[PDB]
Each structure stands twice: as structure tokens, then as C-alpha cells.
Design a protein around this ligand. Structure first.
Ligand SMILES: [Cl-]
Ligand SMILES: [Co+2]
Ligand SMILES: [Co+2]
Ligand SMILES: [Gd]
Ligand SMILES: [Gd]
Ligand SMILES: [Gd]
Lengths: 26, 21, 30, 21, 26, 21, 30, 21, 26, 21, 30, 21
């Protein structure tokens, strides 16, 4: 389970310079 | 969405790439 | 609030705290 | 951009708010 | 909800050079 | 205290400034 | 324990771990 | 101080303990 | 309680250059 | 193991040193 | 996946995410 | 090693996978 700041830390890790979107209401 | 796939359920780092730009 | 010096994942942590349930876009230059 | 500005210089939480959805 | 190290990370973010106190028994 | 306001309940970043020096 | 090189939020994380329920004061120079 | 010492040089967990309440 | 990434952050803090092992199945 | 000692139960930073190399 | 620039605790966070329940060894040079 | 390579240069998640148990 990846939640909260831990989920966005993981997005940063996998996406890096590509950037990403965090849209929890989605 | 990402919260349901990755926080409520579990996801792989590959699934996490779905949310890259 | 104070000004910030934020690199790497620290920026993403800050965005998470500022935006909360609204979410955010992380868009670096490439 | 904001990623670069916060790291090379400084940025405020109010500038970061511009990137919320 | 901001708990534990996440709460102190947020205090650091909002307070910065002003410094802060984390007193959970308070 | 801060744990009751911000962890047990929820608080804003403005409320978090109550705990700055 | 080993010695530490800690800047920014990393110091606050370390203080949190060392002090636990006792809490702590974070007091940088200005 | 301790904030500056840990970042410019090094510091021990025992020195950090001095800042607990 | 130290769990997940918080547990490995603490191992890093106490062990540093000695290195460490995180073996949750153990 | 470490998860039982430190996450399920509680451990000290000294106990955490058991897992250094 | 993208390449990574990871120092300090940031490397340990990355190892945790990559390895998950498998765990990992953190072995710096000394 | 991998600790030094990721910090002085760059490293991939696939190289990091080599250090899983
Ligand atoms: Cl964290
Ligand atoms: Co850092
Ligand atoms: Co957490
Ligand atoms: Gd982090
Ligand atoms: Gd953090
Ligand atoms: Gd951290």
C-alpha cells in the first residue's frame, strides 16, 4: 500500500523528469 | 483512481507509471 | 509562511502538503 | 519553472499553490 | 491528518527559519 | 495540543503556524 | 550510533526519531 | 547552533538528544 | 512504532555507513 | 523479526542497531 | 522508469519502494 | 558501489533491484 506522501514520493521516483499528476479525487 | 489502485488496493511501480506525464 | 528552498522529492512533499485532497501536477523542465 | 525555481533559488507556498488541481 | 514524522515535516515547511516546537504530550 | 488538532482531528497549514517560534 | 550529516527536513526527521513522545524544539540560527 | 552544525559539518544523535523536551 | 519507509529511515539513521539489512519476512 | 519488534511492537534506537551490518 | 540521482536517506527510500516485502541490503563503501 | 554511484552520478531502479533480498 502506497498512501499520501508515500504515494507521491513513489510517483516522483518512477516518473522523475517526465512529471506526473496526483489527482486523488479521480 | 490512483488512491483506489495503489493505496486502498496495491499496485506495482509499473502501474504507478500510468500517472506519469 | 516562510519561503522555501526545495529540491528533488522535497518539492513533491511540499506540493502534497499545500494541495491536499485537491492534488497537484508536478511538471519539471526537460 | 517552479521545480527549477524552488531548487536553484527560493519559492513560496503561495507559488506552489498554483500547481494544485 | 498529519501525524508523526509527517506532522513535523509540515511544521518544518510552514515555520522554516522561525523554528518550531513539537510537544505531543501537550 | 498539536496531536489532537492536527493528527486526531485535521488542521490547516495556517493552524500549523500556531506552533512556530 | 554513527555520526550524522543532516540538512533541512532531514534534521527534523532525526530529531523526531531521537526524541519520540518527548517532543523537541527546532531552533535554527537567523 | 545544532541546525547549522549538523549540515555544515557532522553531529551525533547524542547531541540531538539535547533538544528533546 | 516504526513501520515501512519510516523503519528503514530509522535504520539508515542509526546504522549510517555501517550499512544495514531490512528483511521483513524474517 | 524487525517488523515484529519495531513496527508491531515498539523498539528503541539501540534495538534498531541490531540490524546494522 | 527514469534514471535516478539519490543521496543519503533518499537511496534507502528508493530501495524500500523497489524491493517491498523482499527487503534489501544497504551497503555503502567505508 | 551502488550507494556511491546513485549519489555522485545516476542509477536506475533496475540496478537498485540487485540489492533486494
Ligand atoms: Cl517520509
Ligand atoms: Co533530501
Ligand atoms: Co508515513
Ligand atoms: Gd521522504
Ligand atoms: Gd520526508
Ligand atoms: Gd524521509
Amino acid at each position: 500500500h502506497l498512501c499520501g506522501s508515500h504515494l507521491v514520493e513513489a510517483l516522483y521516483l518512477v516518473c522523475g523528469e517526465r512529471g506526473f499528476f496526483y489527482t486523488p479525487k479521480t | 483512481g490512483i488512491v483506489e489502485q495503489c493505496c486502498t488496493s496495491i499496485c506495482s511501480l509499473y502501474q504507478l507509471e500510468n500517472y506519469c506525464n
